[PDB]
Design a protein around this ligand. Structure first.
Ligand code: CLA
Ligand code: CLA
Ligand code: CLA
Ligand code: CLA
Ligand code: CLA
Ligand code: CLA
Ligand code: CLA
Ligand code: CLA
Ligand SMILES: CC1=C(/C=C/C(C)=C/C=C/C(C)=C/C=C/C=C(C)/C=C/C=C(C)/C=C/C2=C(C)CCCC2(C)C)C(C)(C)CCC1
Ligand SMILES: CC1=C(/C=C/C(C)=C/C=C/C(C)=C\C=C\C=C(C)\C=C\C=C(C)\C=C\C2=C(C)CCCC2(C)C)C(C)(C)CCC1
Ligand SMILES: CC1=C(C/C=C(\C)CCC[C@H](C)CCC[C@H](C)CCCC(C)C)C(=O)c2ccccc2C1=O
Ligand SMILES: [Ca+2]
Lengths: 80, 76, 732, 141, 29, 76, 150, 84
């Protein structure tokens, strides 16, 4: 499946989690920003790689990145 | 079944086999349905439409031609 | 592993048809393979290298075999001017009776293809005379091709595999490639010339049976070791000399006459034996510069470390640059390809102007074919050189280890490099097109006197310096009171001045305003293609739009629609862009070459000189004009021997346009289409008894651009080749 | 907390569509999404055209999951509804997917533990050469 | 007439090659 | 689709319809009825249609029709 | 300069001759006192004037019979390239210098983009004639020509 | 219509739709004739080899021929340009 990482540059806006069509990310407690939360990629097996998450990050540089990797049925978005 | 017939024709011609082409002089694909209609509009005036003196179009005329100047206006 | 491709587990677990596609396009990218080590990397390449040589030896072996078995050659040797060389025989059951008649040419017994590679003139010049000679040559290469495979297999065995440090022994390899691979090879080639080639051009046949009790020279090696080498140039072949015969034959084996042999219109054999002998010296002595195991020589590293201009205007100069190149195979391939690409063009530009093979200049189709051949090879090689350059920056470039050296400073001021290349391209583009269009309007309004026809006097001045009488100018070698002239006076100059001022040959052809414009087109083509490629290389590791373009590799589809949209942002993709421009550039080059030459051979340089200044002229008087015999290869009335070129001509157009589909329409459309077909198959009775083992999916984003580009390129090459050969050979 | 389980609950009123399950559902996986409806309502089907929600508990089987979230997301807004979806497999085992941790993912929960987070953020990753030949990748670090 | 090596290269080799590749490609160790 | 439609029109009319007629009945069409035997081949379309008929627009410089010559290249 | 001056080129004379005969041919259908005739006679007079000037200004011609330009720098042909060029660089410099005078005037202001899509014509008219002395850009170059940040 | 974990097969429409399940309509003996005479080709592998080697050589065999096009035939060859 694809590879998705998060960085301490994250501000806890939570927008990507809202942007994801396959429920890959989620927010977890943290203490590196005023929001006190940070994104996480606990289910990268369900990711498709549409990068809607990245398209929704306001950090100067994306704090969530998606590195397209090995292709699986799940990632190829196949209903057959 | 349209374009592939052309490529067939190109290859046969280039190989010097005109008789193996889709043409009027070889393997004919005569569009008979459009031809029959064409003929029907020819026999239309007087027969089907008695009020019509001449044909609807000269493309259905058969043996009628119209010229203006030295140039051809229309014909079957 | 588990299944193909088992050099990559992650790609074998692909349940779609993509696993097969990508399994083929990554088979040679050894570094991306599973469990790869630096040891296995150098060993796989080394082995592949033997495999490549084996194929090359085998390939040439095929040509020799077929020319001997299905070609005249012997008939061609007697009448070079009036015999068409045969490529091989044609056996095609699809052939109609006419096609068999129309194609049986060259005095063959059946339908044959006419060779346009020029191996006939090459082998005749080389010394080969009969078919027996060709067969034993074919045997020899078949043998060499076997020992290539044998050696490739040998060094894949554990007790014969070379260590990585052996591959990184640069100074030893250079000392041997310069001295042995270049020098000794060239030295021994001049040996073949004075033993076989030169005496063969003088009627005497020297093969293995009698090359021992037969002297290449009357004084026979005496004067060489004596020091009076001048004796070998004492009696050259006459001006009335006939090739292959004793009529006018001399005794000399090493001369410097310059110019051409009158009969063959090619360089003197005694000029070329001398050439390679002289070459072999600078190479033999040259391959003793670097250090090995004898306590003498140079440390390449230490030289680079020492070349730092004080006042640090180049920073730390070339320090650490030795390891940067010796550790990165891509840097080496890039340097190799760039160098090779340049001398590939050098070959092209020299073999049409200074023919080295007997009776090759008279064969116009061969001359046109060979020139176009190499200029496209050179072009492709050049883009690859600028592809591994980027790959190097991504995979092997170490920023800290190249701190502030010339390589690093490139990236440091990359914006300046790119913007100026952009300016140069914009300047050339705006005016070359501008002048072409202005002239077209004048011709349209019927006022050719209003054209802008700039004389290329700079280049005309060069030709004068070479000794061309036209234009006047009174430059060096064009002036009686010139130190340069009187220095070379009656050595190579009488032969040179005679040849450069002959109106038949292609030795520094007369150029005018029409030549001025196309050259700027050429200049435009070069600058733009370089602009694309170096912008690709210098941005491979990142930009403002994608700061971390590394981490993603050389080839990736994109980075999504965010940040404005990032399609074709990878270094692989600007390669993809540059190939188009390089195809456009070489296209302009070969159009220029072929039009100038067909008008010359036709004795009508007027048509080129007056029509090449406006673009309608190119369309009408070059492309539309010379397409006549080609497109009539087959007709509603008949078929000709040019029918195959007519067929290929359309074939090229078809492949070319088919590629437009992959380049214009992109993936999401086709993916949604296929999944409706996936539905159909499962819901169709009798058909759903049969199930696919690989899931049908649309070609990937990058794969599309590759497939599209290949079609575009194949069409490009096959279309022009169909035109180049037919229009030429139809007229000759 | 334990996830909900099912299932014998009815499914919505639909007429049939071509976007339905295929062999993949039979041999690979298929998904189910479930929800509670206050009224019998009409909704747009991701696979098809239009279907009628059935008042009370509702069960829908869809292929691919994304279809599950797309419909579910639509259920959350538009009308207010609480939904959940599971992964079926073919053996009969079932797997609870979303929400999966009590609460929705947008909302921070204390139970959750981070996965795939790099504390040296930035593009402070190392050059590819540095990991060359090391199965690793720069981001993985 | 040796020109009957054509079908062999022309068809037989390709068929064998394709069949073999097809099999290797669909293999599941 | 439309491009091959209007090419179908242009060739068919010149070849089989339009042309000069004199007062003996003798009809001489513009392209002389070559549609039937040469439009059935892609090479025929390239040669007898495009190559042949494009001669007017590429030989229009100096004429009143040179603007078409300019727009021809201009559109390419 | 392997060419021959146009004044003494036969090909150059044949073109003027052939062109005039073509226009005169058309002259026949329209009769005399006529609009097209006056229009054609005006083209003929414009034609003669053209060729006359080219010869008069010492422009070489090629075997083609058409003038060719010398851009080497040779003094006899500055008119051909160098003189017009300097004229260009003056204007090009003018336009660019005025264009750059506007952006600097605009840069420190409110919404700077607002005056890039809606021109401040009073400001532009104030700055247009500054390009007249634009080659005193040189004296800006001795100090504040280009930014030091990059 | 239904949905039970108990029976996934049925849940996901794995139905042998147009399947017969009916007894053999073929007359016996006829079947037995075909069952004993087509038996060698049913072993696989060997059929693959029989079709390659057999199909290959059978093809080669039609190497031999006449009214194919093996006749440039008595036709004076043209020159036909600069000559050759
Ligand atoms: C180098 C490859 C190659 C070769 C050697 C051939 C050879 C032939 N082709 Mg094929 N073809 C090819 C490539 C090739 N083609 C490609 C790439 C295409 C796609 C464009 C085609 C499309 C094509 C078409 C549409 C037709 C041919 C036809 C023919 C036959 C015409 C000669 C004839 O009439 O005699 C004799 C005519 C016969 C019918 C004799 C039959 C030959 C016997 C039955 C062979 C026995 C079957 C063979 C053993 C099974 C193969 C086994 C093998 C795969 C292991 C000839 C056998 C024509 C044809 O076969 O007629 C129907 C024809 O219609 N070709
Ligand atoms: C199926 C093909 C076909 C088509 C497209 C036509 C079309 C036509 N017919 Mg023909 N017709 C046909 C078959 C067809 N007919 C057959 C098989 C026969 C028997 C052999 C006829 C006998 C026939 C007659 C006698 C007349 C037509 C007439 C007409 C024209 C006017 C019809 C109308 O309603 O106007 C409206 C008519 C009225 C409001 C008055 C009603 C009285 C009507 C004409 C009887 C029209 C062009 C008329 C005509 O000649 O037009 C100039 C006409 O008089 N048709
Ligand atoms: C010394 C010569 C040389 C060598 C050793 C290499 C070696 C390599 N190249 Mg480079 N390259 C070269 C020259 C060379 N190249 C030139 C001259 C160009 C300009 C065209 C390129 C442009 C290039 C690009 C863009 C890429 C490489 C890549 C690679 C690497 C992977 C190769 C691979 O597995 O793919 C296998 C290749 C194939 C299976 C060939 C299939 C596609 C070909 C082009 C189609 C064949 C043409 C067509 C079918 C002709 C038949 C038509 C018919 C009608 C007659 C490998 C290290 C890749 C890389 O960087 O690694 C990630 C990469 O993407 N090369
Ligand atoms: C590697 C370069 C090369 C190339 C491009 C060709 C190309 C060709 N060969 Mg040649 N061939 C070669 C090497 C090559 N051959 C060598 C080294 C030999 C042994 C000396 C032969 C012996 C040979 C024969 C007997 C025939 C051909 C024929 C042909 C033509 C049809 C293809 C064929 O039948 O298969 C080639 C058959 C082989 C046995 C070649 C395999 C040899 C090595 C392993 C490759 C085709 C032009 C046929 C022909 O002339 O068409 C009418 C034909 O009858 N070839
Ligand atoms: C004939 C088609 C065509 C043309 C005209 C161009 C032109 C250009 N290309 Mg493109 N290219 C093409 C095909 C073409 N390309 C294709 C098929 C590909 C493969 C995808 C590419 C890939 C490519 C890449 C990757 C790059 C280019 C670049 C460029 C620019 C190069 C610099 C230059 O020439 O300055 C001169 C400008 C021109 C020649 C075009 C100007 C057109 C007219 C003359 C302008 C005047 C307009 C006039 C007033 C009429 C106005 C009309 C009215 C309605 C307003 C130039 C604009 C490079 C670039 O951007 O340069 C920095 C760049 O890197 N090209
Ligand atoms: C249906 C149309 C058709 C077909 C099927 C053929 C077929 C053939 N032609 Mg004919 N030809 C045609 C039309 C056609 N032609 C027309 C219209 C003309 C103009 C009149 C000609 C003019 C012509 C000439 C002059 C010649 C032929 C020859 C040949 C034969 C090539 C023999 C060969 O190399 O083997 C195999 C094919 C190849 C080696 C080339 C294939 C290239 C592929 C794409 C390389 C890429 C492969 C890739 C790596 C994938 C590999 C997988 C694979 C191994 C499974 C073959 C029988 C030649 C011949 O007689 O043989 C000696 C010959 O010289 N043709
Ligand atoms: C190819 C490179 C090249 C370059 C950069 C130049 C540059 C120049 N040439 Mg030269 N020239 C060249 C090649 C070149 N030439 C060749 C190959 C020939 C052979 C004919 C000549 C023959 C030639 C002649 C006869 C003359 C020049 C002159 C000039 C100068 C004219 C500009 C000026 O007046 O000052 C700048 C003016 C302003 C800035 C205002 C300029 C320095 C002219 C000169 O000598 O200048 C006084 C002149 O008389 N050139
Ligand atoms: C203030 C106006 C201005 C100035 C001083 C410059 C200056 C420069 N440009 Mg830019 N450019 C401009 C406008 C300008 N440009 C506009 C509007 C565009 C969009 C088409 C561009 C697109 C452009 C590209 C792609 C490139 C440059 C480049 C360059 C540099 C090299 C010279 C050149 O090729 O330019 C050529 C000019 C053009 C291609 C466009 C024509 C610009 C028009 C004619 C001027 C604008 C007039 C403006 C509306 C006046 C406002 C009046 C005001 C008082 C109200 C030089 C620094 C090159 C570079 O980077 O150098 C290394 C380069 O590759 N320019
Ligand atoms: C003596 C003589 C001469 C000479 C001249 C010269 C001196 C020369 C030259 C030359 C030159 C001067 C050449 C060049 C070139 C080049 C090129 C072609 C390039 C390239 C490249 C590339 C492709 C790169 C890549 C890369 C990258 C990008 C990254 C890093 C790595 C690398 C490096 C790989 C003359 C003629 C005058 C006269 C006569 C004689
Ligand atoms: C002489 C001559 C010639 C040659 C020339 C040359 C070769 C030269 C050159 C040149 C060069 C080599 C130049 C350079 C440069 C540079 C630079 C570095 C620049 C800059 C700039 C700037 C900065 C500008 C700016 C501006 C202005 C000033 C104006 C407007 C605005 C603007 C901003 C644009 C010829 C033969 C052709 C012709 C005759 C004459
Ligand atoms: C047509 C098309 C397809 C559909 C094309 C497909 C699925 C190609 C499938 C290939 C078929 C099976 C025939 C291929 C046979 C060729 C002769 C290749 C030879 C086989 C080997 C030698 C490689 C895409 O998937 C696509 C994706 C992205 C951009 C553009 C396009 C696009 O234009
Ligand atoms: Ca010459």
């Amino acid at each position: 499946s694809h590879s998705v990482k998060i960085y301490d540059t994250c501000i806890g806006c939570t927008q990507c989690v809202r942007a994801c069509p396959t429920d890959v990310l989620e927010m977890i407690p943290w203490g590196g920003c005023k929001a006190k939360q940070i994104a996480s990629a606990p289910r990268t097996e369900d990711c498709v790689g549409c990068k809607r998450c990245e398209s929704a990050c306001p950090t100067d540089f994306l704090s969530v990145r998606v590195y397209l990797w090995h292709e699986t049925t799940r990632s190829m978005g196949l209903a057959y | 079944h349209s374009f592939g017939l052309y490529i067939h024709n190109d290859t046969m011609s280039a190989l010097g086999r005109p008789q193996d082409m889709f043409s009027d002089t070889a393997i004919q694909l005569q569009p008979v349905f459009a031809q029959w209609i064409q003929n029907t509009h020819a026999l239309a005036p007087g027969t089907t439409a008695p009020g019509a003196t001449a044909s609807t179009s000269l493309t259905w005329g058969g043996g009628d031609l119209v010229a203006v100047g030295n140039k051809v206006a229309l014909l079957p | 592993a588990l299944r193909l491709p088992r050099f990559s587990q992650g790609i074998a677990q692909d349940p779609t048809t993509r696993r097969i596609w990508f399994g083929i396009a990554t088979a040679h990218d050894f570094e991306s393979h599973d469990d790869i080590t630096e040891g296995r990397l150098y060993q796989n390449i080394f082995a592949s290298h033997f495999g490549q040589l084996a194929i090359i030896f085998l390939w040439t072996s095929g040509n020799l075999f077929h020319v001997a078995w299905q070609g005249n050659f012997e008939a061609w040797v007697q009448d070079p001017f009036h015999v068409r060389p045969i490529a091989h025989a044609i056996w095609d059951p699809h052939f109609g009776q006419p096609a068999v008649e129309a194609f049986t040419r060259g005095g063959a017994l059946g339908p044959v293809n006419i060779a346009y590679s020029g191996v006939y003139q090459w082998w005749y010049t080389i010394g080969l005379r009969t078919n027996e000679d060709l067969y034993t040559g074919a045997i020899f290469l078949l043998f060499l091709s076997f020992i290539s495979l044998l050696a490739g297999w040998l060094h894949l065995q554990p007790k014969w595999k070379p260590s990585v440090s052996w591959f990184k022994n640069a100074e030893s390899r250079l000392n041997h490639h310069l001295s042995g691979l270049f020098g000794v090879s060239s030295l021994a080639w001049a040996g073949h010339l004075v033993h076989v080639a030169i005496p063969g051009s003088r009627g005497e046949y020297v093969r293995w049976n009698n090359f021992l009790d037969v002297l290449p020279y009357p004084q026979g090696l005496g004067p060489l070791l004596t020091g009076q080498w001048n004796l070998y140039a004492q009696n050259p072949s006459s001006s009335n000399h006939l090739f292959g015969t004793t009529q006018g034959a001399g005794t000399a084996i090493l001369t410097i006459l310059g110019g051409f042999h009158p009969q063959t219109q090619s360089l003197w054999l005694t000029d070329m034996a001398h050439h390679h002998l002289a070459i072999a010296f600078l190479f033999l002595i040259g391959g003793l510069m670097y250090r090995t195991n004898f306590g003498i020589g140079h440390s390449i590293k230490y030289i680079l470390e020492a070349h730092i201009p004080p006042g640090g205007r180049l920073g730390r100069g070339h320090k650490g640059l030795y390891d940067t190149i010796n550790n990165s195979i891509h840097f080496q391939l890039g340097l190799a390809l760039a160098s090779l690409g340049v001398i590939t063009s050098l070959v092209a530009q020299h073999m049409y102007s200074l023919p080295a093979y007997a009776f090759i200049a008279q064969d116009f189709t061969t001359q046109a074919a060979l020139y176009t051949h190499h200029q496209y090879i050179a072009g492709f090689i050049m883009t690859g050189a600028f592809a591994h350059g980027p790959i190097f920056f991504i995979r092997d470039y170490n920023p800290e280890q190249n701190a502030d050296n010339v390589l690093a400073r490139m990236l440091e001021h990359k914006e300046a490099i790119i913007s100026h290349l952009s300016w140069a391209s914009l300047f050339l583009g705006f005016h070359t097109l501008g002048l072409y269009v202005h002239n077209d309007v004048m011709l349209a309004f019927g006022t050719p006197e209003k054209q802008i026809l700039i004389e290329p006097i700079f280049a005309q001045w060069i030709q004068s310096a070479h000794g061309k009488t036209s234009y006047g100018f009174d430059v060096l070698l064009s002036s009686t009171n010139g130190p340069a002239l009187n220095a070379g006076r009656n050595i190579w100059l009488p032969g040179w001045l005679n040849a450069i001022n002959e109106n038949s040959n292609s030795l520094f052809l007369t150029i005018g305003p029409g030549d001025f414009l196309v050259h700027h087109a050429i200049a435009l083509g070069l600058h733009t293609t370089t602009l694309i490629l170096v912008k690709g290389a210098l941005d491979a590791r990142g930009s403002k739009l994608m700061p971390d373009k590394k981490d993603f590799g050389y080839s990736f589809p994109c980075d999504g629609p965010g940040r404005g949209g990032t399609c074709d942002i990878s270094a692989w993709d600007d390669f993809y862009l540059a190939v188009f421009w390089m195809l456009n550039t070489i296209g302009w080059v070969t159009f220029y070459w072929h039009w100038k030459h067909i008008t010359l051979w036709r004795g009508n340089v007027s048509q080129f000189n007056e029509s090449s200044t406006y673009l309608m002229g190119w369309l009408r008087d070059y492309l539309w004009l010379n397409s006549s015999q080609l497109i009539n290869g087959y007709t509603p009335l008949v078929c000709n021997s040019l029918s195959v070129w007519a067929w290929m001509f359309l074939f090229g157009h078809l492949v070319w346009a088919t590629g437009f589909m992959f380049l214009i329409s992109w993936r999401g459309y086709w993916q949604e289409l296929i999944e409706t077909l996936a539905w159909a198959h499962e819901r169709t009775p009798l058909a759903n008894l049969i199930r696919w083992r690989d899931k049908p999916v649309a070609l990937s984003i990058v794969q599309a651009r590759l497939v599209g580009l290949v079609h575009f390129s194949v069409g490009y090459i096959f279309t022009y080749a169909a035109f180049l050969i037919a229009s030429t050979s139809g007229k000759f | 907390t334990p996830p909900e389980l099912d299932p014998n609950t009815p499914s919505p009123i639909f007429g049939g569509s071509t976007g339905g399950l295929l062999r993949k559902a039979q041999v690979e996986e298929f998904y189910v999404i479930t929800w509670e409806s206050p009224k019998e309502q009409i909704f747009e089907m991701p696979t098809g055209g239009a279907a009628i929600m059935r008042e009370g508990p509702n069960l829908l089987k869809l292929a691919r999951k994304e279809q599950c979230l797309a419909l579910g997301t639509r259920l959350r807004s538009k009308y207010k509804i609480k939904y959940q979806f599971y992964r079926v497999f073919p053996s009969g085992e079932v797997q609870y997917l979303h929400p999966k941790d009590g609460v929705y993912p947008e909302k921070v929960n204390p139970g959750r533990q981070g996965v795939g987070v790099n504390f040296r953020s930035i593009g402070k990753n190392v050059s590819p050469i540095e990991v060359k030949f090391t199965g690793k990748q720069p981001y993985d670090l | 007439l040796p020109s009957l090596f054509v079908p062999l290269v022309g068809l037989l080799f390709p068929a064998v090659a394709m069949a073999s590749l097809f099999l290797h490609v669909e293999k599941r160790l | 689709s439309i491009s091959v439609v209007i090419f179908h029109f242009s060739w068919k009319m010149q070849s089989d319809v339009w042309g000069t007629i004199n007062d003996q009945g003798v009809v001489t069409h513009i392209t002389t009825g070559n549609f039937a035997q040469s439009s059935i081949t892609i090479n025929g379309w390239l040669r007898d249609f495009l190559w042949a008929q494009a001669s007017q627009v590429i030989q229009s410089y100096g004429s009143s029709l040179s603007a078409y010559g300019l727009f021809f290249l201009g559109a390419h | 300069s392997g060419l021959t001056p146009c004044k003494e080129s036969k090909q150059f004379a044949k073109r003027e001759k052939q062109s005039i005969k073509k226009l005169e041919s058309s002259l026949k259908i329209y009769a005399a006192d006529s609009a097209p005739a006056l229009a054609i006679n005006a083209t003929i007079e414009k034609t003669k004037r053209r060729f006359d000037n080219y010869a008069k200004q010492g422009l070489l011609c090629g075997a083609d019979g058409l003038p060719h330009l010398i851009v080497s720098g040779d003094q006899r042909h500055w008119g051909e390239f160098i003189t017009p060029g300097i004229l260009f660089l003056y204007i090009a410099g003018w336009i660019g210098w005025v264009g750059r005078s506007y952006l600097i005037a605009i840069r420190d202001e409110k919404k700077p983009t607002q005056k890039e899509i809606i021109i401040d014509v009073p400001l532009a008219s104030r700055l247009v004639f500054r390009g007249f002395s634009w080659p005193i850009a040189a004296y800006r170059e001795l100090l504040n020509g280009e930014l030091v940040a990059k | 219509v239904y949905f039970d974990l108990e029976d996934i097969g049925n849940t996901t429409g794995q139905w042998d739709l147009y399947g017969s399940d009916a007894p053999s309509p073929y007359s016996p003996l006829q079947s037995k004739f075909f069952e004993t005479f087509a038996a060698p080709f049913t072993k696989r592998g060997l059929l693959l080899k029989f079709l390659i080697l057999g199909g290959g050589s059978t093809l080669a065999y039609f190497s031999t021929t006449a009214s194919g096009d093996i006749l440039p035939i008595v036709k004076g060859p043209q020159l036909p340009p600069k000559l050759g």
